[PDB]
Amino acid sequence: SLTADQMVSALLDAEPPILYSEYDPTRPFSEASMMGLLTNLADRELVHMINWAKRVPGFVDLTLHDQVHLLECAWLEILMIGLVWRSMEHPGKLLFAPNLLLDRNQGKCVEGMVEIFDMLLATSSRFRMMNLQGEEFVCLKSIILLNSGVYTFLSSTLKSLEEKDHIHRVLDKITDTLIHLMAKAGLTLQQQHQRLAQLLLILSHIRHMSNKGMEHLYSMKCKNVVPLYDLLLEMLDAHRLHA
Amino acid sequence: SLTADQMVSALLDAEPPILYSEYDPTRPFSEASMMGLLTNLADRELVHMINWAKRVPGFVDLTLHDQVHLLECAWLEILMIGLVWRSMEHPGKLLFAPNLLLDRNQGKCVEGMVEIFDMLLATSSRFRMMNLQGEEFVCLKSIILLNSGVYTFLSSTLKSLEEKDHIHRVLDKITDTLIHLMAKAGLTLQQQHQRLAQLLLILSHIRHMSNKGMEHLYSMKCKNVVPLYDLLLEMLDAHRLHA
Ligand SMILES: C[C@H](CCc1ccc(O)cc1)NC(=O)Cc1c(-c2ccccc2)[nH]c2cc(OCCN3CCCCC3)ccc12
Ligand SMILES: C[C@H](CCc1ccc(O)cc1)NC(=O)Cc1c(-c2ccccc2)[nH]c2cc(OCCN3CCCCC3)ccc12
């Protein structure tokens, strides 16, 4: 009982900010660790992602455990679609941050990184070619959050089935919202279903990139101590005291 | 210039056969290597997948190199959606072959395997819940073949761009075909776009499962000698002599 334009406005209002890379811009770059740069940016974006996630319509009606599970599952996909989105207008570069716009050569210092840079760049080029709009982008990122882990709840409890039912209902509303957007934009019925499919097929590519990067993650340094699940739980298990 | 019902019939006619597991059914099962069973079945299904792939409308108009690249990319996803499809009517089991229907316990002998069994079972349950039809299934498997590697062509040649253009056009026709199917089935316009989205979001899960299994593949025994690319090329680089 949210309309389409309500859902769009809600998602647009919940958008997280664009963070800066923390390096000293007054000192030489070759001293910079790209894995430290990425690790430190990603850790800071994560805190803002939890706050975004709570403002996605339907998300907080889920159990805490299910909220954690969706985010644990989708966090890198969600970082990556935000990255490809802000890179759209910067052909051949990735806009990690407004003070950190890298080309593929700047990924070659880390084993396996340039392959993921090449995939991200390719995905950003496809959004450019499709002329992805800001309204469509926030619907897609919401879908990733709700869809990516919904099939790995290891649960068949009644509660679990009620949760899955609700998620599938929210996802159906976002679908309606995407379609509303395109119709408003002047697309034919046929063009509408064609573009919905083009947009959702990109999500398979974003999953692919996430998996490939997670692979290099749980070897390569970073943050691995204190399981991600309980960190999410602490961030998610909020009190109501700062009301 | 293929209609929707033409495309459905074509895809239905191109379907590969259902293969049997080769073990001696007269000898004890604990002697059986599940990784050998899977390896040997998957290797035999691969040969039939190449022949299916050539009968997917639009596929053979691609360059040989691009055909190889799509299959190298999508072969495990394509095996997995066929598996979840034939398992649909066998709750709690995976129908690897008509003489090889396994439950999750039968995957616990291999490190990491039961997790992938659990994901496949969950995906087959979702197809059951949606009542996936045979016509929809062959469209989805065709989409996986054409979509999964189209963004990792490392190419911007004119030829490459023409290829990408054609693939995106074939994918748009299959989209039209899915929609045709549902309209025929009596779904409302709204239900049609909702179900198209539900179906394509499952493809993100199938990608996930493929990636996770490939991870355990390129450590675990199997077939790894003589790069998959050249094997695909030999199977794909056919003569016309048996005309
Ligand atoms: C090139 C991509 C860029 C990922 C990325 C980061 C931030 C963005 O806003 C968008 C996209 N990296 C990966 O796909 C995987 C990866 C690598 C990597 C890739 C190739 C070779 C070697 C290393 N290091 C990290 C560090 C990290 O952040 C720190 C880990 N924290 C993050 C928050 C969640 C808990 C773990 C998150 C992802 C990655
Ligand atoms: C449980 C799944 C089942 C995969 C599968 C096989 C056949 C089907 O028809 C459907 C699905 N396995 C995997 O996801 C990955 C995998 C493992 C595995 C999973 C967990 C732990 C350990 C091992 N061994 C093999 C062997 C193989 O086939 C042989 C390799 N050939 C196949 C043809 C392409 C060249 C390589 C293909 C896939 C897999």
Side-chain angles (χ1 to χ4, degrees), chain A residues 1-26 28-243, chain B residues 1-26 28-243:
Chain A
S1 224
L2 217 55
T3 179
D5 268 277
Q6 270 169 348
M7 172 73 78
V8 170
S9 142
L11 302 180
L12 288 175
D13 286 16
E15 274 288 275
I18 309 153
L19 300 186
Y20 279 80
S21 185
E22 267 167 272
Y23 64 108
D24 185 342
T26 74
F29 204 57
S30 62
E31 230 186 52
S33 172
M34 196 129 319
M35 304 165 30
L37 284 168
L38 295 208
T39 294
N40 277 287
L41 172 67
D43 286 336
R44 285 173 37 219
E45 290 180 272
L46 188 66
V47 187
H48 298 275
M49 188 190 299
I50 291 315
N51 316 313
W52 161 77
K54 314 233 217 108
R55 308 195 43 188
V56 178
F59 189 77
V60 292
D61 301 316
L62 293 170
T63 69
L64 295 212
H65 151 80
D66 284 350
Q67 293 174 38
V68 175
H69 177 84
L70 291 176
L71 271 159
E72 182 174 19
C73 267
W75 69 269
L76 182 59
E77 291 186 82
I78 295 162
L79 294 181
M80 289 174 166
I81 194 180
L83 175 72
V84 296
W85 163 258
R86 35 178 208 276
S87 298
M88 238 171 112
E89 292 174 332
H90 301 282
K93 297 155 176 287
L94 288 174
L95 188 54
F96 278 100
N99 70 337
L100 191 62
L101 183 52
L102 307 182
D103 53 44
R104 77 183 303 266
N105 261 62
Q106 288 171 105
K108 296 181 163 144
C109 184
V110 183
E111 182 172 287
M113 196 165 103
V114 75
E115 296 69 11
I116 301 177
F117 276 31
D118 283 341
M119 295 180 255
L120 292 157
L121 293 158
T123 312
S124 191
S125 164
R126 168 87 179 138
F127 283 166
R128 177 167 59 254
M129 147 119 225
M130 291 184 68
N131 206 2
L132 181 69
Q133 303 293 303
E135 291 81 352
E136 297 167 322
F137 162 71
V138 303
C139 291
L140 286 184
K141 189 177 41 159
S142 299
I143 286 166
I144 288 165
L145 167 74
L146 291 174
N147 174 65
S148 292
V150 66
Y151 293 163
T152 41
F153 301 123
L154 314 178
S155 199
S156 300
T157 60
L158 180 66
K159 200 189 203 155
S160 177
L161 295 151
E162 283 161 348
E163 301 261 270
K164 288 203 230 140
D165 186 77
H166 174 249
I167 295 169
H168 274 132
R169 278 196 253 100
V170 167
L171 282 165
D172 284 352
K173 176 50 52 121
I174 299 167
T175 298
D176 296 342
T177 301
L178 276 173
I179 285 309
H180 170 86
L181 284 168
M182 320 180 167
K184 222 188 174 193
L187 293 198
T188 60
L189 207 46
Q190 180 180 39
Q191 295 170 326
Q192 287 166 51
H193 73 269
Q194 287 177 351
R195 184 174 182 84
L196 169 75
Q198 293 149 13
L199 294 175
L200 296 175
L201 287 189
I202 291 157
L203 301 195
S204 162
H205 292 99
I206 288 157
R207 175 84 75 143
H208 187 70
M209 297 190 288
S210 170
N211 288 332
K212 287 298 281 226
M214 297 262 311
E215 261 208 84
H216 297 284
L217 247 199
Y218 299 154
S219 14
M220 304 256 196
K221 197 179 349 138
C222 246
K223 140 148 280 98
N224 228 140
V225 273
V226 191
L228 179 47
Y229 189 95
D230 320 334
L231 180 68
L232 293 178
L233 193 66
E234 269 257 348
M235 287 191 267
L236 290 164
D237 193 2
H239 63 222
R240 310 210 195 196
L241 316 179
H242 296 182
Chain B
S1 224
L2 217 55
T3 179
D5 268 277
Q6 270 169 348
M7 172 73 78
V8 170
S9 142
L11 302 180
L12 288 175
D13 286 16
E15 274 288 275
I18 309 153
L19 300 186
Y20 279 80
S21 185
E22 267 167 272
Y23 64 108
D24 185 342
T26 74
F29 204 57
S30 62
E31 230 186 52
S33 172
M34 196 129 319
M35 304 165 30
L37 284 168
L38 295 208
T39 294
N40 277 287
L41 172 67
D43 286 336
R44 285 173 37 219
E45 290 180 272
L46 188 66
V47 187
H48 298 275
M49 188 190 299
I50 291 315
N51 316 313
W52 161 77
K54 314 233 217 108
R55 308 195 43 188
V56 178
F59 189 77
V60 292
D61 301 316
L62 293 170
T63 69
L64 295 212
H65 151 80
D66 284 350
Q67 293 174 38
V68 175
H69 177 84
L70 291 176
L71 271 159
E72 182 174 19
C73 267
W75 69 269
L76 182 59
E77 291 186 82
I78 295 162
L79 294 181
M80 289 174 166
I81 194 180
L83 175 72
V84 296
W85 163 258
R86 35 178 208 276
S87 298
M88 238 171 112
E89 292 174 332
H90 301 282
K93 297 155 176 287
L94 288 174
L95 188 54
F96 278 100
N99 70 337
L100 191 62
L101 183 52
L102 307 182
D103 53 44
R104 77 183 303 266
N105 261 62
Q106 288 171 105
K108 296 181 163 144
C109 184
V110 183
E111 182 172 287
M113 196 165 103
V114 75
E115 296 69 11
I116 301 177
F117 276 31
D118 283 341
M119 295 180 255
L120 292 157
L121 293 158
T123 312
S124 191
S125 164
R126 168 87 179 138
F127 283 166
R128 177 167 59 254
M129 147 119 225
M130 291 184 68
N131 206 2
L132 181 69
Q133 303 293 303
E135 291 81 352
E136 297 167 322
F137 162 71
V138 303
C139 291
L140 286 184
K141 189 177 41 159
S142 299
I143 286 166
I144 288 165
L145 167 74
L146 291 174
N147 174 65
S148 292
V150 66
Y151 293 163
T152 41
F153 301 123
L154 314 178
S155 199
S156 300
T157 60
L158 180 66
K159 200 189 203 155
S160 177
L161 295 151
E162 283 161 348
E163 301 261 270
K164 288 203 230 140
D165 186 77
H166 174 249
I167 295 169
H168 274 132
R169 278 196 253 100
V170 167
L171 282 165
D172 284 352
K173 176 50 52 121
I174 299 167
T175 298
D176 296 342
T177 301
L178 276 173
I179 285 309
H180 170 86
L181 284 168
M182 320 180 167
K184 222 188 174 193
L187 293 198
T188 60
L189 207 46
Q190 180 180 39
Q191 295 170 326
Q192 287 166 51
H193 73 269
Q194 287 177 351
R195 184 174 182 84
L196 169 75
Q198 293 149 13
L199 294 175
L200 296 175
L201 287 189
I202 291 157
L203 301 195
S204 162
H205 292 99
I206 288 157
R207 175 84 75 143
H208 187 70
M209 297 190 288
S210 170
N211 288 332
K212 287 298 281 226
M214 297 262 311
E215 261 208 84
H216 297 284
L217 247 199
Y218 299 154
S219 14
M220 304 256 196
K221 197 178 349 138
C222 246
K223 140 148 280 98
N224 228 140
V225 273
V226 191
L228 179 47
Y229 189 95
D230 320 334
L231 180 68
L232 293 178
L233 193 66
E234 269 257 348
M235 287 191 267
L236 290 164
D237 193 2
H239 63 222
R240 310 210 195 196
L241 316 179
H242 296 182

